[PDB]
Design a protein around this nucleic acid. Structure first.
Ligand code: MG
Ligand code: MG
Ligand code: MG
Ligand code: MG
Ligand code: MG
Ligand code: MG
Ligand code: MG
Ligand code: MG
Ligand code: MG
Ligand code: MG
Ligand code: MG
Ligand code: MG
Ligand code: MG
Ligand code: MG
Ligand code: MG
Ligand code: MG
Ligand code: MG
Ligand code: MG
Ligand code: MG
Ligand code: MG
Ligand code: MG
Ligand code: MG
Ligand code: MG
Ligand code: MG
Ligand code: MG
Ligand code: MG
Ligand code: MG
Ligand code: MG
Ligand code: MG
Ligand code: MG
Ligand code: MG
Ligand code: MG
Ligand code: MG
Ligand code: MG
Ligand code: MG
Ligand code: MG
Ligand code: MG
Ligand code: MG
Ligand code: MG
Lengths: 67, 60, 144, 185
RNA sequence: GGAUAGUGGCCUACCAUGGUUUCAACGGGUAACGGGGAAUAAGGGUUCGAUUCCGGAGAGGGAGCCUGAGAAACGGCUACCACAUCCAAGGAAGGCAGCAGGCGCGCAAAUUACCCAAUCCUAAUUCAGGGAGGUAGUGACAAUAAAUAACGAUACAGGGCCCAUUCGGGUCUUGUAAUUGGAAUGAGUACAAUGUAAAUACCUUAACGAGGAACAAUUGGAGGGCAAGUCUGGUGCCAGCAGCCGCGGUAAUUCCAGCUCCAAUAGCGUAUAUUAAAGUUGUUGCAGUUAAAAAGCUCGUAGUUGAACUUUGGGCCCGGUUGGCCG
RNA sequence: GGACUUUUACUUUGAAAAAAUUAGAGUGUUCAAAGCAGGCGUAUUGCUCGAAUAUAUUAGCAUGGAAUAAUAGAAUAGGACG
RNA sequence: GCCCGUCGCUAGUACCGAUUGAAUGGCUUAGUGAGGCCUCAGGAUCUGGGA
């Protein structure tokens, strides 16, 4: 079997010059799991509809339950 | 000519040729083996040179 | 020299005269007039799918006495109307009026086949399936 | 938008489809070197056809012309390599000769048979396709491998399978399971 | 002069009468985006190129314009035209010839999946984003390798061959066999590790996994062209076949079947197109008395074509490149 | 640097020239279609061959040739050199 | 023996043809003319003549 190997001058270097997924294989990194790449896309888009922070948008829609 | 001649007989003969079913036979080898069988037939053993050479004879 | 200019600048006349005379070629003129796209019941396309009007009983040309069994089809992309033949014994019992069918040519480049006068196409499928398969038994004719 | 994956076809088919003479002449070839296709002959006669074409073209050029001398000599040395062209006949007027059986004779299926190992050319086919016989420890399972000169000596069973040592087969070892179970405990 | 980034009838004002054309202008057609190229293999050609790269054009159709270095931009805006969606009827809102997916259209064409790991691109930027792109699913578009078996035993039969006065079978294998004989391998299934961004497959590899019930090859064809039967049964100018020639009206070598046989074989038939065959478009290279074809006749412009003759013979020099007999 | 040159066709050799495709060299992707790799050791801290060549014709450029075929020349001499 | 044309039947193609017939696409006269852009004005307001 032929492959390819690397060996770093120290483990401060390995953790910095390595792919983040490689460390995963090894046990030198937790798989920071995240939302479906499309869920994230959709989170972005849902956000574009809101100009500013928005807490002022929760309150004005709380006047809705008056009209 | 004529374009509205009878249609009743469509499928006549196929419908009335008495069925007989295929006879279960030995299986024939597929691939290279089959070309082999042909070679030993056509050339190696040889059968009859009845004047010339025959391929599908019956009641010769 | 009989005819054709032999000279060294006579290349224009030599092409023109060739352009000219190509027209006497059947398939060149068919091609360039676009006879396909214009005449021809199909588009110029390989097959065409139409709908079955009446079931015909075409009597064969001499010295052949028989009844040839066909279908008048009305091409779907077209409304062009066409009689087509239904190959193999029976098979007409497969079709019925108002059915969909697939028509292909007869392999005579235009031109009708044998003793069948007028017919330039043949059926290939019906109600979605394959006339051939229905003949054998590999398939069966769809509900409606 | 990604580069064309290039490809080529590797056969030609008989112009005349039902030539009784060609037809027999082809079958015996198969029957001899254990082919399964007419294509296995077709493929070769195609390989042949170009080589002739190359050579034909070369010959037209001037004797001692650069391309002719370059590519001509290249073609010759390569044919020599696999052992189609003999050493004497080393000057391409003969690659211009050169029939199909020459090629045929140099397949791994044919060589595996020629000396020992196989006994009958078909057993030769089956052994190869079945992960026995090798070149180095490099196992080869293509009957058309075409054996280079320095390799003829290194055709032999592989360090695996039985034959070339180390474990019998799954079915033998399955009968050893029907010996010590019935008669023993 | 004005306008433009800037040349220029680009536009305007004055003035003039020019510009193109049988060496085909101008007009029409195009089921026309141009190119690199593709298919066909004596050569000369013929046909094709929406389509992985380069150029150009477009974003439902037109025009207009803001921003900006760069757009006459459409995943920008404005107007009209055509579609068209939501409503509380007041109004508001859309532009898949991006990726997928749907309708329609038709002979005709796949997933509303995963990822930024690679290739690279962008930003304030090593980090974010990227349906660019890559991954996988669908997939007999094309192209490559090539399993469906391999070896011995026996039973008569043989042809070899020494002898043959005559039994014969005997050891060299030719193989057709209705009991036989053990060996082999992956198609699959699957620990495992490899693979991968994560998976899947491939490459490896424990455990399993072949005797005919199989892990059981097809597709056409068997009168001629054209490789393969004058078998048997059926039909009776019917039913069907047949590219073409031709078969079928009661012994069918063409139909419908069984048997057997051929060809190509994981592929083979059919339909349409085109290329070769085609020297049936002919420059290479056709034909024209009678087969298709010399204009009734002469003049004649364009076009093509067009006799011979003008420094040739002789002398000197240099240095190359193959090859010979010698090395 | 000054002062002036009858026109052309043809052919030669050369430059300018994108890649993929095509032809074709090298390399045993297990074979092959492909790909542009790969190969050697001290396989413990590296050594090293590559990633050719050809074609690319019409037009434009540049150079050699002076056969073949055009062109222009001096006759009311308004000729040629000085 | 061969064979020609009218006349008669079935089926198919194309032609002529009242309908000053119909349809789609490309330009286009005359009239009407949105919109943005340029320009003559304007001046809610909001400042130091300008906006
Ligand atoms: Mg994201
Ligand atoms: Mg934000
Ligand atoms: Mg004519
Ligand atoms: Mg009718
Ligand atoms: Mg339509
Ligand atoms: Mg002017
Ligand atoms: Mg005028
Ligand atoms: Mg003309
Ligand atoms: Mg177009
Ligand atoms: Mg084109
Ligand atoms: Mg193109
Ligand atoms: Mg198009
Ligand atoms: Mg644009
Ligand atoms: Mg659209
Ligand atoms: Mg318009
Ligand atoms: Mg726009
Ligand atoms: Mg855009
Ligand atoms: Mg309301
Ligand atoms: Mg889409
Ligand atoms: Mg869009
Ligand atoms: Mg398809
Ligand atoms: Mg990123
Ligand atoms: Mg930071
Ligand atoms: Mg994507
Ligand atoms: Mg099978
Ligand atoms: Mg079995
Ligand atoms: Mg069959
Ligand atoms: Mg025959
Ligand atoms: Mg009978
Ligand atoms: Mg019979
Ligand atoms: Mg039969
Ligand atoms: Mg074929
Ligand atoms: Mg010539
Ligand atoms: Mg002729
Ligand atoms: Mg005549
Ligand atoms: Mg005459
Ligand atoms: Mg002359
Ligand atoms: Mg040149
Ligand atoms: Mg190149």
């Amino acid at each position: 079997s032929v492959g390819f190997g690397l060996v770093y001058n120290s483990v401060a270097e390995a953790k910095k010059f390595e792919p983040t997924y490689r460390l995963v294989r090894y046990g030198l990194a937790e798989k920071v799991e995240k939302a479906s790449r499309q869920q994230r896309k959709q989170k972005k888009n849902r956000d574009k509809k809101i100009f500013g922070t928005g807490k002022r948008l929760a309150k004005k829609v709380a006047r809705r339950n008056a009209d | 000519a004529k374009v509205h001649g009878s249609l009743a007989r469509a499928g006549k003969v196929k419908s009335q040729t008495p069925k007989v079913e295929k006879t279960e036979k030995p299986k024939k080898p597929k691939g290279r083996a089959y070309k082999r069988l042909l070679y030993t037939r056509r050339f190696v053993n040889v059968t009859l040179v009845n004047g010339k050479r025959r391929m599908n004879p019956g009641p010769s | 020299g009989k005819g054709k200019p032999r000279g060294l600048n006579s290349a224009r006349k030599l092409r023109v005269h060739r352009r000219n005379n190509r027209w006497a070629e059947n398939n060149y003129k068919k091609r360039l007039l676009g006879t396909a796209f214009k005449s021809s019941p199909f588009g110029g396309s390989s097959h065409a799918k139409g709908i079955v009007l009446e079931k015909l009983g075409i009597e064969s040309k001499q010295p052949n006495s028989a009844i040839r069994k066909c279908v008048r089809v009305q091409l779907i992309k077209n409304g062009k109307k066409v009689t087509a033949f239904v190959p193999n014994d029976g098979c007409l019992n497969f079709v019925d009026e108002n059915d969909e069918v697939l028509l292909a040519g007869f392999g005579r480049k235009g031109k009708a086949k044998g003793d069948i006068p007028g017919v330039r196409f043949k059926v290939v499928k019906v109600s979605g399936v394959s006339l051939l398969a229905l003949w054998k038994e590999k398939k069966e004719k769809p509900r409606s | 938008p990604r580069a064309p994956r290039t490809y080529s076809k590797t056969y030609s088919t008989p112009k005349r489809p039902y030539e009784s003479s060609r037809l027999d002449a082809e079958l015996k070839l198969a029957g001899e070197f254990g082919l399964k296709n007419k294509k296995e002959i077709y493929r070769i006669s195609f390989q042949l056809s170009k080589i002739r074409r190359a050579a034909r073209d070369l010959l037209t050029r001037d004797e001692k012309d650069p391309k002719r001398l370059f590519e001509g000599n290249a073609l010759i040395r390569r044919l020599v390599r696999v052992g189609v062209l003999s050493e004497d006949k080393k000057k391409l007027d003969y690659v211009l000769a050169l029939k199909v059986e020459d090629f045929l004779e140099r397949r791994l299926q044919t060589q595996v048979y020629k000396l020992g190992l196989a006994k009958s050319v078909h057993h030769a086919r089956v052994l190869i396709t079945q992960r026995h016989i090798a070149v180095g420890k490099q196992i080869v399972n293509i009957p058309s491998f075409m054996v280079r000169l320095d390799s003829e000596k290194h055709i032999d069973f592989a360090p695996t399978s039985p034959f070339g040592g180390a474990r019998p087969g799954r079915v033998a070892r399955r009968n050893a399971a029907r010996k010590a179970e019935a008669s023993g405990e």
